[PDB]
Amino acid sequence: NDPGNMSFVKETVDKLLKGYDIRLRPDFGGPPVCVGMNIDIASIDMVSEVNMDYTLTMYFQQYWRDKRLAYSGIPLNLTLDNRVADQLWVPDTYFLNDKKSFVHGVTVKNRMIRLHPDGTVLYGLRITTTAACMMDLRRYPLDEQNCTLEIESYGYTTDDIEFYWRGGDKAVTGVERIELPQFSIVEHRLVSRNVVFATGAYPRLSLSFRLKRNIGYFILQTYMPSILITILSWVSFWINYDASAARVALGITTVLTMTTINTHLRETLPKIPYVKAIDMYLMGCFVFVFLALLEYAFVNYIFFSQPARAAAIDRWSRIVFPFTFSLFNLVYWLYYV
Amino acid sequence: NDPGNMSFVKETVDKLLKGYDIRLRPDFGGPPVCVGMNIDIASIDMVSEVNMDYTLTMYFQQYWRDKRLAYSGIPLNLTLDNRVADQLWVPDTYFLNDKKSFVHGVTVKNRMIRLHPDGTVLYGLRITTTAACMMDLRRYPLDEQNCTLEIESYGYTTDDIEFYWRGGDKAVTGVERIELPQFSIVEHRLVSRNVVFATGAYPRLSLSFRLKRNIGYFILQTYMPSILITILSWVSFWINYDASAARVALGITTVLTMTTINTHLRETLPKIPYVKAIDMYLMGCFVFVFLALLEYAFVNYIFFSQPARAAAIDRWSRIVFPFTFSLFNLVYWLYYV
Amino acid sequence: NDPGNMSFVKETVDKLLKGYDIRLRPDFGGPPVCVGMNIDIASIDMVSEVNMDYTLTMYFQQYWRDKRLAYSGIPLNLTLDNRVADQLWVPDTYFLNDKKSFVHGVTVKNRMIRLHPDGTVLYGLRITTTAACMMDLRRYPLDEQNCTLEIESYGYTTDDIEFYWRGGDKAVTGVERIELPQFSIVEHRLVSRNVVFATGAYPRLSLSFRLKRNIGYFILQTYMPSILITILSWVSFWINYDASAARVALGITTVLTMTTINTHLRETLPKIPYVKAIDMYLMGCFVFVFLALLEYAFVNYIFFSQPARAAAIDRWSRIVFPFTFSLFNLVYWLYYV
Amino acid sequence: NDPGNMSFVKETVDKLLKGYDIRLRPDFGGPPVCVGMNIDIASIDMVSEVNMDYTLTMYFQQYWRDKRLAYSGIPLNLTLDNRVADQLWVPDTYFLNDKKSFVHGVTVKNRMIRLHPDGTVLYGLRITTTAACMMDLRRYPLDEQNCTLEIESYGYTTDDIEFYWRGGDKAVTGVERIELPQFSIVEHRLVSRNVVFATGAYPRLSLSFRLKRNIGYFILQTYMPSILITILSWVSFWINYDASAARVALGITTVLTMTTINTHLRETLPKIPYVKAIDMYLMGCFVFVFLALLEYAFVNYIFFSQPARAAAIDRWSRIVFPFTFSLFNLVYWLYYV
Amino acid sequence: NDPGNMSFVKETVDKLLKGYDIRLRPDFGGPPVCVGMNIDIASIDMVSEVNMDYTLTMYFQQYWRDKRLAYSGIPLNLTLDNRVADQLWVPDTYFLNDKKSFVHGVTVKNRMIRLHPDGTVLYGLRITTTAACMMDLRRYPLDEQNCTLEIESYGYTTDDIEFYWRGGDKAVTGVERIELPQFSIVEHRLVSRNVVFATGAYPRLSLSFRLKRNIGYFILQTYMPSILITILSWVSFWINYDASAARVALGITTVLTMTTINTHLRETLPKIPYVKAIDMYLMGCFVFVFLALLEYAFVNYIFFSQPARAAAIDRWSRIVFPFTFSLFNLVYWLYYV
Numbered sequence A, B, C, D, E: 001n002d003p004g005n006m007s008f009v010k011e012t013v014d015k016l017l018k019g020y021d022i023r024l025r026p027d028f029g030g031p032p033v034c035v036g037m038n039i040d041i042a043s044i045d046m047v048s049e050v051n052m053d054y055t056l057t058m059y060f061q062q063y064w065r066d067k068r069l070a071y072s073g074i075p076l077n078l079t080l081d082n083r084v085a086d087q088l089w090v091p092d093t094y095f096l097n098d099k100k101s102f103v104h105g106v107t108v109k110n111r112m113i114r115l116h117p118d119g120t121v122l123y124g125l126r127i128t129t130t131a132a133c134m135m136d137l138r139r140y141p142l143d144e145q146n147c148t149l150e151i152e153s154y155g156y157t158t159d160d161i162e163f164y165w166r167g168g169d170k171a172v173t174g175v176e177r178i179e180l181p182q183f184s185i186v187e188h189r190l191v192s193r194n195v196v197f198a199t200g201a202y203p204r205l206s207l208s209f210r211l212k213r214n215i216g217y218f219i220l221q222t223y224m225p226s227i228l229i230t231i232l233s234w235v236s237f238w239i240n241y242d243a244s245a246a247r248v249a250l251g252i253t254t255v256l257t258m259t260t261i262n263t264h265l266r267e268t269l270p271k272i273p274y275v276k277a278i279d280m281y282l283m284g285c286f287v288f289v290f291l292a293l294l295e296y297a298f299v300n301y302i303f304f305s306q307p308a309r310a311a312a313i314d315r316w317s318r319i320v321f322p323f324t325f326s327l328f329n330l331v332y333w334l335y336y337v
């Protein structure tokens, strides 16, 4: 009688679980059970190009109605201990593209079960998942990436279970509060569809983010050092051509440093067989510093027989190299922006 | 009768657990159960800027009263085996910002259950948790960071469970005994509040530390080597301008070393798109060593036609460069301290 | 009576499991139970030469008939909760060459049980496995590798269990959708056989892939830098022989850089005792840059007494070195392609 | 009757566990139960300064008497299967300073239960534990460290459980067989005491080792290369002062190499804010190589106007630098040894 | 009656387990139970000098007779589901020197139980174990190592359990099929003995391998680069002594490169306090390249006053250095081979 009478509540819950078969889905043999899903994204831990995946922490909630759990006489929503979920049927929801995922278990399993008088079940889970995201690094680091989270039922087909985003476009929250130092989230989308396999058609929910990579880190880390090395190679043009050791040292160091910058950057990224946007810039800067050393090799070859021509080549190189490199940056930054 | 009669104690404990429903919170359907929490911080293992998190080991204790566990006739507090916690209701306490946490289980699960005659339950857990802490590295390494530990109930709302710091300002102990080689704990605070979500309002407890980074390591590791390289570039000012190979070698090595110091440091830290305080110093030192090499390029360009002017430029550079760099350090250390 | 009557379904399932002995295989003491297997390959995460293994994620399905589970009166296929698999006999299938494998367990264990009226059981598992693959790196990076997945019964011999690929050549799907940045899957094969051990003959299923390594990454990372360094060493041939510091610096840097490229590459790969294809190219490039420095050591030795002969040696070296190195690349790329 | 009659033994063991309450400690409500502990140290896996911890593998044995397990008629010690420990009360022993620990479980859980006729229980566990050890690196690598293992009861106070080292000074064995390549174990001590907390006074057992770091590795790795670089800088004193490129190159390389040695070593160690003993030596060697380069900068500045004075400075530097550096090593090695 | 009658088989197995006490070993209170062990080594994953351990994957089989499991009327060997092992007594076998081990559990636990009419039990486990192996690196990389796997009973003494290698010298198979890229298995041995501890005497089985390290990798990685650098230092002997910058650059680079090779190699290996065989070679090569630079420092010191003597020193150095270094290799390779 009394909702505050725990003895009466215990009798009501025991009656619900008496004869309850966890092996059978709600409305077994009849219409499919509709499962509504909402996601509260706590954070996106990291985005890795090397492993081609991202780490996501979220509050995963499932909404469905089980008539076997309908109770009367208690005008309240029953929030039970999370351990009761082992005595109830739950959807076999799994993430299609996940690589490693777990449910937090401190201090207890991060799980929620809330019952409703009509038999509606609220099932919440705090899950940290690492989901695979293949990335196209051709325009890297000025690339825009699209990473998805695929939600699907494992065993039950569309004849048994149906998926939908509960709340429509507002089913997923917390996207605007995600703080990625390297990326900005341009847009997120929700997709519901059915995928046909050899064992039947299965419900599918898709959550996708469009990530825009910030360029600030790469300007300070790769682009500026490459520019400084290229400018450093131009110093030899003002050095006297009789200083063979000095000018060759400028040519050697700038050429070798440019190669080390190019190779070191590729080591950090995964072994991809195509040229990236930054690789085009680094290889472009290598030509300028290589031609600067070849410029002195030409001057050193003829400065004895033709000192006048050698001086003109040095004088013209002081203008052509800064001018050509400025144009190279102009065409480069217009293409990739 | 006799408290030392184990048969009588076994009967008393069995009576408490007879008809006990773990699925129901204490005072189910009535006033919310108040849970008091205390933390004994054993240590802070590490603070990582790369992962933006810190590792914490602590003794987590929860205090609440369950009238179903009230016993009479035994004027003693019953300290039971930790395995009895699986037969009792416990709060669904979880850490909001934790990334990976566990309860120690050697030799047994690091868990404590102590009962009281009125039904009060003491529940202790030794937990090592890695909690996310977003850090602002703009003033790094002279930055001050604020890392928090958020405590919240997962399933139960404020209508069912209430949180409070047991003992007020003294609820958290062991803060002054924390030994961080890189940080000093300026202050810790305790905050109690209620947070409203889509599923209701939830109790919240917040433990926050203000960490001040020690500068001793970075002086020896980054600042001093940068100063020594800048002073090294000034050696060329006293070298004769006819030593083209020697002075250019001093210019090349100091400029290249400065770039390697700048890029290597940024690799250790996470890829952030903004300039840090140390980055300002390293880029400032790069200009001084770059101008030192450009100084000889100017001297080498005119020392043949105008030897007198070239000697004066070398002589003035011996004073201006140490003076300007001293001023640069003065303005730098006043801004960030 | 009614298939949609959950009470009738619960009675039918309880009858099947009443007296069911999980310790006994189907048709125990009689003909061996035939298990059909299909694999839906979700992805191949990575291929590691250092660890000599690859990571595979797949949908592993087992097909067999158990007459103890045959039911009548329900003209439907019973898709039960995955937790019922703990109450049924399943084959002791294990992967012979796996190093670390697991079944995904979010949100539930990634497991499927589907029953059929005749007693046929469909048992699906989503497994991520790391399987050992010994690789022959003699032709690396132009090598072609053959990695296998060996499927075998652990305890039961061919007298008790038999394996076969269900669907023949189409038993394994998703191979053409595998995206390896470094490898291309030339062909996959399915092999069924029996392997004799000391404890008897055991069924065996083999899934093998032939992987062709893409050469695009290694051209940009190793081959091109080696070519550029070799061309860099040729610059000294046009430098005047009186520039002893400049030409020796070109010889030193190219020789030292070539050694660093060779040693660094071998560190990434596992410690193998044989020479690889790339090692042959790197050691070939080392000879060219070493002879270039020895060329000046010969010129510097005689340019005082015999300036005319020294000039001819420099002039001839400008032709022989590019010509010989071009031939070296011709014979090299014909041998390994 | 017959000890070899397994049916009689099974009846005796079942009688012991009939009515046995694992939730109650032996002599509950009476005198505290005394637990004797012995440790057989299998090995010390590693000692890490970076993580400030060490890894320990040991055989952990607990000795206590439970009158509920006393049996008569069998004049033998009952060695039972390790799975019976789940049906018995065991002390809630945990390691206070451990960071990650586990009990080995191959092929079974590495656990031992041996019963005695009077009710004495022998409980053995093979545990690998990583225990935190704060280290003072001011005298590193000539430092002596003291790492402890703290043993304490988690829930029970001194009113319920008491700890003591069984066998006194011989409670811990295997210390002399520990093989640490980098450390030598000078001495180990055993301490028994009671620690008072907010929840009461708890028994404490402490096992501490005094570790002396071997200096052989650091002589070959850091000290000798630093000496060789310092001697290398002295070569310029015998080089003619007109060789500006050669002597400056000797000065540049020795100074730059010394900085790289200093910075690289600090990266391996944890970020501590104080100067270590090795840091004093490396910074001392930096001054000698820096003054050597400044010595030529002084000679190069005056060798034209005052060639006689410049020659004397070179001649005196050939004696003062080896003599002063020898004295620097003398005072250094006397202070830290 | 009928062996193919599963109902009769189920009755027979239930009778065996009725009244079966897992807490009691077979023949409890009587003669010790003899356990025969065989190992089928699948692979040796890796051998690590840094961690002083090796990883082993094997099929571990235990053979013993339990009269409580003897059955009659079924003339067949009963291969039961692996889950029946939890209802049977098994030996408490553990590996003494293991550091981390596990039993594979995909798709089921890699476990086998086979019964025999007389009560003999076959118990198989597929175990991957990392066992500690202390290594003597004094002759590294030409060292020969002896790594063992120690098998012992944890709780039961020799009065209760006895170990023996089933099949004698053929108890361990698959040794000849082990493929270690860096090592060759010279010989394996089997040892059976009893070890006395404080708690009694325990059975012990030892499997030991003698590993011979292949030298092919280290010739290409360390020995050849050291030889090439030493030969590189000899180039300065043919360079004119007036080329001070060139010859000092050859001396500086060879000396610095030799130090980097020596220090980098020691970093990969564990921090041991003794000199290795390769360390002797690297330090020997350092002297040759250091004396080569000191050779020019002597020539540069006297080539002005005594040009004739300086030319002879260069001429003699062209012969003595190759001759002495050839002898150094002769004595070195004879000592360590």
Ligand SMILES: *[C@@H]1O[C@H](CO)[C@@H](O[C@@H]2O[C@H](CO)[C@@H](O[C@@H]3O[C@H](CO[C@H]4O[C@H](CO)[C@@H](O)[C@H](O)[C@@H]4O)[C@@H](O)[C@H](O[C@H]4O[C@H](CO)[C@@H](O)[C@H](O)[C@@H]4O)[C@@H]3O)[C@H](O)[C@H]2NC(C)=O)[C@H](O)[C@H]1NC(C)=O
Pocket: B146, B147, B148, B187, B188, B189, B191, B192, B193, B194, B206, B208, B209, B210
């Ligand atoms: C690291 O950064 C975090 C986040 O910024 C800081 O956490 C904040 O700490 C401050 C205190 O320093 C908190 O402010 C206090 O909040 C209490 C709780 O507010 C709840 O309840 C009130 C009603 O009582 C509601 O209005 C409110 O919405 C909340 O539901 C208040 O009770 C406190 O009030 C006290 O101060 C006011 C004046 O400001 C007085 O009028 C009151 O009488 C009383 O004395 C106070 O406002 C703040 O809420 C925390 N934020 C979060 C997000 O937790 C950490 O402090 C910081 N770490 C360090 C070391 O500085």
Ligand SMILES: *[C@@H]1O[C@H](CO)[C@@H](O[C@@H]2O[C@H](CO)[C@@H](O[C@@H]3O[C@H](CO[C@H]4O[C@H](CO)[C@@H](O)[C@H](O)[C@@H]4O)[C@@H](O)[C@H](O[C@H]4O[C@H](CO)[C@@H](O)[C@H](O)[C@@H]4O)[C@@H]3O)[C@H](O)[C@H]2NC(C)=O)[C@H](O)[C@H]1NC(C)=O
Pocket: C146, C147, C148, C187, C188, C189, C191, C192, C193, C194, C206, C208, C209, C210
């Ligand atoms: C990676 O490397 C592995 C190992 O080398 C390759 O695996 C081999 O694949 C070949 C097929 O390409 C296998 O050869 C086939 O074996 C079948 C099974 O043999 C069992 O049964 C027969 C009796 O039927 C016994 O005699 C035998 O001992 C085994 O018990 C055969 O049925 C096949 O026969 C077919 O070809 C023959 C002619 O060769 C015809 O006469 C037959 O009619 C029939 O068409 C065949 O012999 C071989 O067994 C595999 N080896 C292993 C160890 O598994 C992978 O193919 C390779 N990967 C790639 C991509 O190439």
Ligand SMILES: *[C@@H]1O[C@H](CO)[C@@H](O[C@@H]2O[C@H](CO)[C@@H](O[C@@H]3O[C@H](CO[C@H]4O[C@H](CO)[C@@H](O)[C@H](O)[C@@H]4O)[C@@H](O)[C@H](O[C@H]4O[C@H](CO)[C@@H](O)[C@H](O)[C@@H]4O)[C@@H]3O)[C@H](O)[C@H]2NC(C)=O)[C@H](O)[C@H]1NC(C)=O
Pocket: D146, D147, D148, D187, D188, D189, D191, D192, D193, D194, D206, D208, D209, D210
């Ligand atoms: C690494 O560093 C740790 C921490 O510093 C060292 O641990 C200390 O070890 C010393 C012994 O070397 C300990 O001192 C001894 O403590 C015993 C326990 O004290 C408890 O009980 C007494 C009453 O009996 C109380 O007063 C006290 O508060 C404690 O509750 C004492 O029984 C010992 O007494 C002995 O010496 C005194 C004289 O000093 C005599 O009068 C006594 O008769 C008796 O012989 C002693 O005081 C100390 O407690 C340890 N500290 C901690 C924190 O554990 C390690 O030793 C060190 N490792 C190495 C290798 O040196």
Ligand SMILES: *[C@@H]1O[C@H](CO)[C@@H](O[C@@H]2O[C@H](CO)[C@@H](O[C@@H]3O[C@H](CO[C@H]4O[C@H](CO)[C@@H](O)[C@H](O)[C@@H]4O)[C@@H](O)[C@H](O[C@H]4O[C@H](CO)[C@@H](O)[C@H](O)[C@@H]4O)[C@@H]3O)[C@H](O)[C@H]2NC(C)=O)[C@H](O)[C@H]1NC(C)=O
Pocket: E146, E147, E148, E187, E188, E189, E191, E192, E193, E194, E206, E208, E209, E210
């Ligand atoms: C790696 O390194 C380990 C450790 O050094 C080596 O292991 C040793 O291997 C040798 C054999 O090569 C072992 O020696 C043998 O021990 C057997 C067991 O001894 C027990 O039983 C005897 C009584 O029977 C007791 O006296 C003893 O204390 C032990 O309790 C003996 O039965 C063997 O005897 C054989 O040789 C003797 C002559 O030496 C004959 O008289 C006998 O008839 C018989 O033929 C033998 O002594 C030694 O015990 C092992 N040590 C350990 C610690 O296990 C590995 O061999 C090595 N690996 C490789 C590849 O070399």
Ligand SMILES: *[C@@H]1O[C@H](CO)[C@@H](O)[C@H](O)[C@H]1NC(C)=O
Pocket: A001, A005, A006, A007, A008, A009, A011
């Ligand atoms: C609470 O409910 C139980 C079960 O229906 C009932 O027996 C008991 O009387 C109720 N309590 C009161 C105060 O009526």
Ligand SMILES: *[C@@H]1O[C@H](CO)[C@@H](O)[C@H](O)[C@H]1NC(C)=O
Pocket: B001, B005, B006, B007, B008, B009, B011
């Ligand atoms: C201990 O309590 C039990 C249960 O109440 C009782 O039967 C027994 O007699 C008591 N012991 C004594 C010595 O009275």
Ligand SMILES: *[C@@H]1O[C@H](CO)[C@@H](O)[C@H](O)[C@H]1NC(C)=O
Pocket: C001, C005, C006, C007, C008, C009, C011
């Ligand atoms: C459903 O099946 C049960 C068990 O056979 C039966 O008792 C019940 O009457 C059936 N339902 C209907 C509506 O007939």
Ligand SMILES: *[C@@H]1O[C@H](CO)[C@@H](O)[C@H](O)[C@H]1NC(C)=O
Pocket: D001, D005, D006, D007, D008, D009, D011
């Ligand atoms: C062994 O003990 C049981 C239980 O007491 C008893 O029934 C049986 O007769 C004993 N065995 C013999 C041979 O007496």
Ligand SMILES: *[C@@H]1O[C@H](CO)[C@@H](O)[C@H](O)[C@H]1NC(C)=O
Pocket: E001, E005, E006, E007, E008, E009, E011
């Ligand atoms: C199989 O064995 C059971 C148990 O003994 C028996 O009841 C049954 O009749 C047997 N089957 C046949 C066909 O006899």
Ligand SMILES: CCCCCCCCCC
Pocket: A231, A232, A234, A235, A238, B294, B297, B298, B301
């Ligand atoms: C790359 C910039 C070099 C600037 C040299 C300036 C020389 C000026 C001589 C009048």
Ligand SMILES: CCCCCCCCCC
Pocket: A294, A297, A298, A301, C231, C232, C234, C235, C238
């Ligand atoms: C390795 C390419 C070197 C090119 C030098 C060109 C010099 C031309 C002088 C006329």
Ligand SMILES: NCCc1c[nH]cn1
Pocket: C152, C153, C154, C155, C197, C199, C202, E040, E059, E124
């Ligand atoms: N399935 C055979 C397992 C095995 C191999 N060796 C020993 N046992």
Ligand SMILES: NCCc1c[nH]cn1
Pocket: B040, B059, B124, D152, D153, D154, D155, D197, D199, D202
């Ligand atoms: N054994 C005492 C555990 C503890 C410390 N602080 C709180 N609980």
Ligand SMILES: NCCc1c[nH]cn1
Pocket: D040, D059, D124, E152, E153, E154, E155, E197, E199, E202
């Ligand atoms: N099997 C013996 C285990 C052991 C060693 N030391 C203590 N216990």
Ligand SMILES: [Cl-]
Pocket: A103, A104, A105, A106, B099, B100, B101, B102
């Ligand atoms: Cl967690």
Ligand SMILES: [Cl-]
Pocket: B103, B104, B105, B106, D099, D100, D101, D102
């Ligand atoms: Cl732990």
